[model samples]
Target: IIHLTDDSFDTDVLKADGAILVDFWAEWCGPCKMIAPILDEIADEYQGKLTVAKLNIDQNPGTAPKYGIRGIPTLLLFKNGEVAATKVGALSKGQLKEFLDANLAGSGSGPSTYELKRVSVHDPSIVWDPSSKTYYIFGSHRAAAKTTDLMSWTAFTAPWKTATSNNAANNVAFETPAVKKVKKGGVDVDFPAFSATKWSAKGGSGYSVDGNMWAPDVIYNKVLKKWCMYLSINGNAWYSSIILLTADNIEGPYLYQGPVVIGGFKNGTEYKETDFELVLGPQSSLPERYATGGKWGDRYPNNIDPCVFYDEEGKLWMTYGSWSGGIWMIELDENTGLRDYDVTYELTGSGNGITVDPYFGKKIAGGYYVSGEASYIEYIGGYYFLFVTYGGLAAGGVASDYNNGGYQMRVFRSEKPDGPYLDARGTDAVFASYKLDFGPDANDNRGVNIFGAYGDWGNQTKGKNSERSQGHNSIIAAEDGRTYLVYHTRFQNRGEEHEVRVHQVFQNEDGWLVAAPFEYTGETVKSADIATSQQVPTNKIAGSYKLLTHPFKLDHRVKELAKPVDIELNADGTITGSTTGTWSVKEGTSYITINLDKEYKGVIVEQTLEPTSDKAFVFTALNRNGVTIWGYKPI
Candidate 1:
């Protein structure tokens, strides 16, 4: 019911007493048209607690520029005059609701608007740069916010990183910082030359090297005097391999080093016919040696997960293996790019009388040991700890008949890099040897319960598993002073494809690891939002969005006679490729936008939708651009 403008934007939208959801929109954006109805519904549903309204970009270009809005239909949620969340483009009702629930639904933690909404106002990537006295942000529109007295994320207004050109997709590099300058009366910038554009502008090889595919693991190589990136590539398949990339400049033209696992699963030739037959359940635990299948390059015992760690003495060593071969160790030649020693250390039943149970002692050859792919944390001091995951991720309830794969992480300590590692309970068995049980209990199936050992028969029914299988965790202390555990969670009742979750990790009074629990933020999803067919506003739903190509009759520059909004899901779970149609927008009196009813008699370009409500919505536009748009209704 509120009409927002430049004159009233500050008091009504920014400085409002209540939580506000402000939709930054223009008349021409197609995705904006799709999101208008959802916004209208919220305004009606949350009458007092949340406020919903829109801002006309043409009328408030200055405000839009101040907020660094490149595309239309950017929705910002403000809690008590401070930004709580921000989403770009159109959003499904579910994703929008998730954002509200995370910020609005009284969570005990600090105000958090998860990335499930694409335009997250609060990104930990926005770190304070001491040199420039500003905070730097990367990923989708590099921006700078002054660190001085910075409170709410959106309040850091004055200085922002703006790209030189508007239409360039790869204009910003991941780590490069752009300096602001005065040009043509206001301010312009000299953007760092981003290789992302040049990296993609290749006709020579149709195979695109997506930077995202590079799972980042960095270590300082003393000989190279530069930081080296250890990227895990599924390169050829079956066995996972490591590739090396180093950049003189961190924001790089990262030079590539060929495969590290030279003769394993499928390097080039040998395993072409043999490797495909060894089928594994999922790429969760480290690839077990010969136990699974395939002989790629030069074939060893059967190596899958590789973890390269340097010691305090600066000795480089790697530990990798899976089911058939247990855990194997080898030394790396920094100068030659090869494994120097033929010596491999065994982690399980070593044929010898000396039994080493890194898996906590499960009877299953692969199950009874610490059964994951990599190790983190080298010898910081004399206390060397080897952290790995065991128990494949936990299935929701009905994963396995025996209920194995619900993986959990456990650690082992040793005096030397490749010798006698003992589990927390001082046992060498990988199963009963597990120190952490963060998911469903082996006994009771209700919630998360933590106990020292599975041997505590008296309290077996206590809190055991609150999560499904949590495996392959990559642990790191973020530059922002928070320890983050990046791991994939099993879908329980849902099959394969593990959803990655990054939660703030903490240590308890007993020095035990615990992840701060959070409700699912719809943002990290990729699927359809609508289940059954539904009617929507037509006129207010049509616009010049990044997506959508429909026929519209313009009357005095106002959108009218919009066709139906199409939302379909794909088998691949990609929304649009699965479904089709259009959501049109109709403008009401006093500039209030509403979604018009279907059968308005206008031609519309229909497309598919792949949506997971927490983060973004996808649709193909008339110009043929693939778009995943996000938005929020005014509180």
Candidate 2:
């Protein structure tokens, strides 16, 4: 893609023989900047036939009036030194390609039309909004988006973009009187803004001094009668906190409450004291060992990426942590909308493991600097399911997300909210932590692998749209009596670019969760096009299927990715594939048992799961070894 100036515009596009897509945009045009990656794709894909160029309307003033460009993002398509077509507004890739395919003569290599406009939002903390009849998700950076069908999505005006240093015009989500009162050395301190990055590299510890907001969870507090937002104000190492914010509505003019929990405690440290004592009276009243800085982080948690929810018993609980320690849960006072500081814990005889900490609450999962983070617990059926993400999130700079950001969703369950959660093989999530020397590849087998790098063979994009590093999930119990697991996923062939995804989650007869191979499009196993629910004497499910397992692990490490392999499930109860197996579907039940490396039990559903067909039957089953296998048969 070439950046055109007024001096170069004539030579670059006006006189060019080939099709030239000249985008007239400015830095201030938010929509223009949003389509950056799309333009880059157009540049690479149409390399020989079409040229994608950018002309800043603000700088290159001569071209606009000549072409009668009125909008900021008016794309003028030129061919043989003449205007061939014109498009206005920043549209998604599918529609953009439509403009190209219709205008650019003899062009075959373009989108056939896929409405799957994948949106990016890391660790989407989704919730069902009954009032608005929408599904809302508030992710990292305090950015938000909503969906009515969980299919099409649209982004909300981000707080960071609208916020100004001047309080009167600041358009951030939250505001409070304390935001004005709290200051450093009598100087007026700015209110804590979501995407407004926080810093201080004084320790030489090399932290994310620039990283701003991270995974936020919102819920309508029953007691407070306000939409409570648990926003993680990120900090260096263990130096972070999850603050509370509230509004009368889901989308808010939120009132900043206060810091719920503080991390990175060090003895006689001015920074820790300034952040702590103001919330909990005095740190001196607690254990002296809590004040020991590095040691505290070694065993405790970095207070970020919080998931707030209520237990069946009506107790408000928050599970929060990152790499520093492990996933921890602390009770919150509904009245105050903050941590219930009076709560304490002791080693228990039940659950997965034992005792709890006085500061960071109970250790739910991960320790010893293990990979698992972004802990979420959703109670379903009679059990509480714990979901944790493993491996690095960002690729930093790598061709594949698998090697570095082998991030995948892993699950475990407990009967209680503050759990000693355990995997299918009885592996406690707490012990998921590995020795420091084990490095990044150490804990790949820790959490129960949900699904890894996989591609849908039936979709329009096919294998080219394979998914990688799908984790940091939030489970949804919709108002219409359906379940979903919402998370963000990186791609196989791309860099760190990611998009939010939601898959319908189902529980087998044995009471375990399984995810659909494809993104949610109102497809349910029970309502599958070939939908069969205990309709015995049916052979509709037996056919050729695309099979894969979530066995992939961290990068450059020896592990198999969740790529599709062809297999067949015969109507005569035979399973034939690279590895032979016997299969059985009970007469009165939808339960299916297949013997492969092990006996795997699962249920079958009809969905548009297979990319090669419009609708197909898919099965998600689990082996007791915490291994999950999926097979989608094209009908």
Candidate 3:
């Protein structure tokens, strides 16, 4: 590895022609030494595209503090003089490669995309009706909207009205009564005095009579031949439950269909609210399994954020869960919109009553470490793409502030709906360690925060206005056969306000999903199969290009648009402008490759930049780690 100092840092990295990986370390750090050889291997293996360098923190004090280096063994990848991604602590060769593959180009990152369309909304879910050729968005508190072209949108009335009366409220059903209390002095205490909220869905159908539903998702159940809206009653707490509502049309009077599944159940028997007292002890105490790493297996008690969809084979599935436990999935009978088998449940451990399997269905993804919630799954291009939200909900003030609990989107996929779902690095979404955990203060494993606070100005001149609290999304496969993501996002400096947004989602070479960087503008990129089958000569692609490299560290919650860096794809196959590289294309296909000196070398596909525009060119590519690199020919 090349030893870098404050003096050599600028020319060796910042001013370098392409991409450079820098390691900030100290001699005393064992992890630094552990990763040293890995860096050397990467340097040698990626010699043409990436440069590797090491800076001893003790020897290079200036650079360390400049980048907020609080921990030893920090790794930063710089591209064209900008920091691309940063990593702290030690990583095995596989993990290190995963990190590099995600950020650098052509390092086997797989397929990737370079944009996301920022819809200004909160807790958004979406569904596309092929017959109507319209996209409908559902949000918290029953707010909704729709768009015919996925661009211009108009508000619409909620299918179901707010509930009224215990008759209406009582119609809402739960496997267990929504009533429980805490034990004080070895005695059950009542509410108000004990300061614990008890489960109570007294009035109307279990659907909130007060219009308190959140995270509403809708899907078309072909077998039912109707629209199904899956929703959660109440806020993010022990009081939440996933309910089903049915409507004959996309816009209608959606009537409640009763509780499809509840928190805990065993073969032939579901646990009652009182049965949870053994685990919760007192209602005033941490509500059922609200403590650390508490999982209420097969019986998803505090079930919320319902995502119901049918796979290609026509089997129906529902995935739901939140903070206390991770996300869980259960298969449902397509004919009845319910589980085919008897529900099962079990209490593991003392006091906590952790459900042994909590789900009659399997957990395809999620755990508390990643705060997996608001999960939606879409089948496209032969892959089951699972999208989820992580982090706390909206807060006052700047949404971009990392501490403000800015909600972000993430994804994982599996061949089968019952997932061994994995992220770009092949880490199982349900089991991966936290990507955002910094140093020793970290106690929990966090999932990859893909669509967090990373800023993208959607038609805004100032970068200050960006997406935040951006999660609770759904997917739509358009009539043209392209997949799109629909979600809501709060803006920075905009307080708690939010708006709905939509973007096309792309599958990388490795079969992972990558969303566009901006909101949908009536543009769609063709699939790899479609694009690869087309005839395109290299002359059509030779021009001045605008390249935007996705940030290396996706989980950092940085709020800003991915700034464009200029490059030139010369007719002579020589690349110039922002970086130096050589390029080539396979005949009769969109498949192309670039080997940037000191930067990236990977495969990318050419596509129409704007389907409805005055003719522009765009290309999307991914490195080994699945980081999207976008190139657009300026109009």
Candidate 4:
């Protein structure tokens, strides 16, 4: 071995055989020891091909001082006795290998090239365009992105300008909202002459002029042959509304149709909405309950977060609302892409006892400051699923900073579209909220909890920090009937910086909805159908899996992250690790049932690069409550 002392500094290293790597390290320096084991392994793997030695900087102070090492663990690669590579800090094994491959001769292997690029889109709603075979997601702030394979994405622009008929909102779309009498700055109303001020495009004089539009859902209107957009105009108060916009193309020159449901006038602002009389009676004869809530807000919808869908009967329906009363649904006209005016509600109640309102449609999930919003509904198989967001979105109105923001997504299902939607526990979604009736009693266990903030959760090897506050998601079944969950998330230390995320969705044996523990990387979770064939190949069923479980619980002030545990699904019918339950696959399929004190319904599947870019086997299971999802990563 070559020494760092004057004894052999010149003859030993300067005349060493082949290529050699010298680790200039200090024993007492804490960080310098991090790459110690890595060096030992590399030496053994490339033993005869390369020479490896270490030089103590403290002991050999006068030797090789001119090599210009700044850090304790400086790596010097010598080829033909000439300095070829120098590194000053520690690196991961993969990183170090990549460095070695690039600088050292005969290393033979190069670094991996695959990488994932993501973007930010809060409150995203999926719009599948089958004609182009493209999937588009429109979210808050008029931001959007499109993907052909769901793995890669590119952001496109939506109409967001303050121009008249002459301006097409920020130069991205064909045109924004404008109307009749194009005189006088074109009215700034969100109409389609096409136009978010007051409830109607023409409701408030300068309504939404500050230009803050919230969540928007878009889809191709088959009846009208146009791309229809349901957008919420946030009037910065309870005085908000969801309006209609239509475009000949998906990209848009979206012309505004009008406001569907106008809300937030019960507090007595002069900006009364235009179409209140169409749903409810005239503002004077309106039911007494709509008139009496808090001072500026009421127990009805604040009119934002619009999610649209076609029911089993081919009728268009929209379920929307924020934190005022609850998530509400109303039917839309096929030809007009606006609210169905002929469908009127009944004034069943006169006083504060109005248990339900005909004008506001039906309240599906959440109620009265209960902290739920973003209603998205889908009809798959035989049942209609209703998904909603609960807890505060971020820091602002409710003092919900990023850590305890408590943004989470959950679902309730029913046989009908406008539901008596029920969770897996058979609990009705419309309960109480906040101080008096609904505090922890109603809020915590509400929507079957899916994904939330991560603490020490995620990859067992990576040990991820929390991505605090994940909510406001859209679930979509693609052209081939594969379901995906599209949502946005904020990070632990990343303040309000958020990005859109997508994960596969599934249904267990009980027909309850379950979610993939990891993001969707173009992986298909196959169903068992052993009658004619084995959907999941037999040999791939058993392996080492990193499992993480989301409990059947909720909290607004606490950020709970599910951590991954090392588990094994044996080739035999047994299980091992922190989880203990027998596991087996059905005769014709890959469906697995694990009893970790409770029946967990999941599927054995394969995922692409869930760990970086290489494909690996993984599993996801959900319990009967519809609240818990157990995710797994395979080795």
Candidate 5:
């Protein structure tokens, strides 16, 4: 083992033969410690062909300063005394390997490319429709034109504009309840988020609802026996109604059901005097007494963009809240067109007797958490994802300033739809927020909508007004068995009204969803597959050995000893009992090396020649880090 330090940095690293990888490290960095072993291993494997050294910045400040060192734990790769590449900060073994592969190219035989696609959108909120198998978007309709009669309007002429013909109040498709939320990276690996390898376009240019707030939202309503949607009114009035759309399938061409008002009123300000406002929570100040525990009129009572859903028990529930004090939850009485106080409850900080987290005994706090709108559904591992947008529409910017530009979405899960909704980590519903994009960022404008480095969605401008301001996300599985991410955007000189984009959601090996086409656009795409297969070992490759962790385990497979043992793979992505197993090729098969149990767990085990042939094979596991030998029986 050779250890080179900063004292010999000039000769050992700068003038070394072949390619030299000089790891600049500090004793205090955790990541540096992690990469130490990997460096030693690579050095040994390459031996005389490559040179690897370590330089301590503390000991040799001269060389470190000459290189313009701003931080410790930086890695500098040199080829023929010239700086080839530089990597700052500590990294994992995988990350380091990928970096080296890029630097060495053909000679090192590493991954040649890392690819990603960039997406830009107007709104961060979007939904994937399982029935239609397409990504759907809902946001402020930018292209809407005021029309007394829109008879010959094209599909692209603000299809979701405020409804004018049938007393529809606002436009057809644009309104506040624009529901969509992305959640596929948690416990469930095969979560119903997207259906295809690549997201197909959902028709880039189409008619969208346009007005002060004509947001559109979609969700599967069990009680209604089809998918349901809701839209917002154009003004500050508390009179948005919930519309019903029934379809034989989850995909639509859905049959429209007229506005189902909680009270007998159209979208208007007159709703304040009615019992509907009296029963629901008040918008601003405190009410006199408990109208059934503080339900108030004008509790920001703009009944705009209502989302409908049936709880796990087959009962109907609707959550509608805005710049209002709280989100009101009331039971649906199919017999009566009006909502009752006896059936209503609150969510977020406003609702009384409402639990934020049942497991933790927490309640949604008031005066701090604001803006509850556009709640979407996602059922996973016996839990429901209730995602709601916080803050106002068009509000865009960094997180520190939580008022205007901090508009985004908050997610909470619950077993009971109306009770204590908790975050997945057993925390309050207002635990964290996912910031929406403002517009095309300077670095990589092509990826999904990511506007400004700091500020409101409207503040996003890339060579012009480019922004995908608010996040109105809806989560759903696709017909193709994959999940997707759909949202709106305004690109280039198109202005906020005309530009909208869509993208596919990809999950890492550890399962985290992120949009691609990074800071720069030309990187390679993700690999096809990295998982190994379960094909039966036809080559008798697994040798035998003694089991170290488990005593009853064998040292190797019987086949490796020229014996007959069938191998099979189990359902849990493991090997079935040693009967017969098949190995499948996935990702890079070359990186894997298997050790057999026949080696007796590093103890002395012998491999003798076969009587029929001179061929001899030796399997060893002695002291390996990532080698697994399988032993099993058919169960």
Candidate 6:
């Protein structure tokens, strides 16, 4: 092993071309001497594939302290100028190679590392155009982007206008710049405000007094032969509604179709101004009571974040809502791409249609049930995955303010699109609580937070550099069958300023969704291939892993001090470190049982953490007691 010091650490190890394993040790340490020979032997065996180096912790205080090395004989494996794995303690040559193999097998488009495409956008909803082979992303503040290869992104102009003059220069508007540059104490210098009169004349409510659009989703309607866009609008009050717009081509001046659905009422009452006023009131009548269920005045003031998709059965469905209302789903007529208000048929077809609950279709998920908003649903592996975002969106963005900016993603699964969805523990997602502590409410059970804020999981942080507030997401499946999660996030340096981010997501062996902790970097591993590779023997799998516990609550910093703990999977089927537990793998399957005390025992599935890091196998499970455990195997 080559000797490295603080001065030489950067040039010799970090800037090296290929993989280099650095042993942080001291001469006086016996364990240091014990592993010397093993390192030397592997130095010869892994000459080209990996370069082994040593750094004396006592002699090189600068480099050792930089990485917070508390123990001696710490082995850090570097690949392409980044730390891939960290191991401490002496091991047999076989075990040493086992660790080395784990990291070595994880190089190249691995799970633990990803290249984040930096762009200024937010609430990113992407629609892949097959004819042009371009992915179009739209978000709040009338922001849009275009990417052909998913690697490099180019900022573009949305067809937003101040009026409907259609006189080229008269109607054209410039791109909405990043919020930081124009902000004067939470005020936008060039804030956009579309003319309500113009929109009203074009068959829209023109209710948005501020003219700011929120969470726009675009999909090509096959039956209509047009690109249809669904966006949320807010009027003077906390009341909001979703509207439909259509365009002949992907990029164009999309004309408004009208307000599709109002937030606090059903279709019948929605068209009636008197009943709408009653529903918007705080009275104890049926309309007032039902409208209260829509979560009128919370963080997000109105019903927003509309996502539309076609299921496997060729039926169109739109899932929407925000804040206290949870989420709601409604069917759409395929031909007109409009809401199918007729509730004559049931899901099982027992009735003419599923029983409709007025304005809100059937509360498929959310409300006092599942405390989430920005509902996006995708059908994968014979299951419908409901992805939602929870917590405050504009909280402080500094690391210390992570809890305040606690916007994160969560998910649940159901066999059908509209019904009782459940988490891993079989807990009803509709009744799941967002609080870490419970009150006297009968439905107050601490359930799982499927995804949350992380400093860094694979090799990169959750968002791009210094990015936080990751939520308000949309999902899209590529022609190659690879799936991606597109969302918005605010940067720590930029404060409340936000941008769009896209990353690949995969389903675990149990048919549940698990996302890579990093952004996409043009890497994708097929689920079938991951399942085959994860069927290896336990001996090959026994090693150290970084265990990531789930966030305890929304609007709170669960992962600020929640660093990954070093956990070991023993050959004898025992688990140690961070928490004591026992584990057993189901042979020939990617499923495993982990008993991390009785409260945490649950079935976990081994999944490839591609697009996050190159770790071939990471264990992920949601416990019956309500928590998600994400394991990261270092590359």
Top-scoring candidate (TM-score)? 4
lDDT of 1 by residue, 1-635 (tens): 57688888878977787778889888888998899889989888778578887888878776778777787789888866667778887889988876776666433233343222122221112223443444322221122122222222232211112234322222232223231221211233222222322322221333333432323344556677654545443323233444444545333445543334422332333333221212111243343432324322112323344556676666786665543334545566564333432223345543222234222111211222223434444442244555655444335334333334545455555677765555434443233332222223332111111111111111111123123455554554434444444455543234543444444433322223333232223222111111111122232233323222222111101111112233432223233422333343222211111122221111111121111122122221111011112111112
Model 3 over residues 376-490: C-alpha lDDT tens digits?
A: 8888888888876766566324335554454556677789986877776676766333334211122433333344453432233125565556777888665676778777766
Clashing residue pairs for model 2:
267-291, 347-355, 403-555, 457-611, 458-610, 458-611, 458-612, 459-611
TM-score of each: 0.37, 0.71, 0.63, 0.73, 0.40, 0.66
> 4 or 6: which has the higher lDDT?
4
> Which regions of candidate 6 are displaced past 4 Å?
1-115, 160-211, 264-301, 324-326, 341-356, 368-371, 396-404, 431-448, 456-458, 462-468, 491-494, 531-538, 554-561, 598-617
Q: Write one digit per residue (lDDT tens) for candidate 6, span 1-635.
A: 78887999879987898888989889789999999999999999888788889888777789877777877788888877777778889888988876776567644442333344567767888898888889998777667888876656788765643244332231232112111112223343332222322332223454333455678889999988989888776443335667666777777666655455564332234324322222122333444334443334321224578989988889898877775545667777687665553433322211112223444566655544334678788777678877767556763434454325566676777888775677666766553334422211223443345555555555444344344567888887677777787887765444467667666666655666666554565554555544554444566667787887765543343224234688888889888987788878766655566777553332233343434335445666666555667775643
Of candidate 5, the 10-residue stretch with the lowest lDDT total is 552-561
Candidate 6 versus truth, CA RMSD in Å, comes to 13.8
Task: In angstroms, give how far residue 147 of model 2 lies from its true place.
Answer: 0.7
Candidate 6, position 429, lDDT: 54
In the order shown, the candidates' Cα RMSDs to the true structure are 23.6, 17.1, 21.2, 12.7, 22.9, 13.8
Model 4 segments more than 4 A misplaced:
1-115, 160-195, 198-211, 267-273, 280-287, 293-298, 348-355, 395-404, 432-444, 455-466, 524-540, 552-559, 631-635
Q: How do the residues 1-635 of candidate 5 rate in per-residue lDDT, one tens digit apiece?
A: 34566667667776777788877777778878877888888777767556777877667676777777776578788887778789887677678767766666233212423222233323333444544344444444422211111111112222222224322333333222211221122121111122110111111233222334445455565444455544443332233444443444433343344333332233234334333333443444323222322132223233444555555666666665444334445555332222322443433333333333111112221112234555555553355656555444442333334343333444555677664555423444432322221112211111111111111111122234433233455544334333333434323233234333333223222222222211211212221221232122323334332211211111111100111233433332233344332222123321122223422121111121211111122212211111213222210
Model 2 Cα lDDT, one tens digit per residue, 157-261? 333212333222232333232332233333433333222123212333654523556898999898768788787766565657787766777877666666677
Candidate with the greatest lDDT versus the true structure: 2
Candidate 2 yields a Cα-based lDDT of: 0.68
The global C-alpha lDDT for each of the candidates, from Candidate 1 onward, is 0.39, 0.68, 0.59, 0.65, 0.38, 0.62
Q: How many backbone clashes does candidate 2 have?
A: 8
**Clashes in candidate 3: how many?**
64
Model 4: per-residue Cα lDDT over 1-635, one tens digit each: 34366456566567876778788888787667888888888877767667777888787886657787777788888865778778876666777677766665443213324334677887888888877889898987778999877767899876533334423542323223433321113232222232245333343455433355778899888877989888887665466777777777787766665566667656443323355554443455444455664532336777889888888888998888877677778877776677776676564433322336677776676665566788888876567888887766762123344334667677888999988888877887776444222123342565566655555534311333356567798888666657788888876555567888888777666666667666776654432221233445656667777666665343434434456677787888677987787777676655667777777776656654333433455556766565464645432
Candidate 1 minimal-lDDT segment of 10 residues: 452-461
Ranking by TM-score: 4, 2, 6, 3, 5, 1
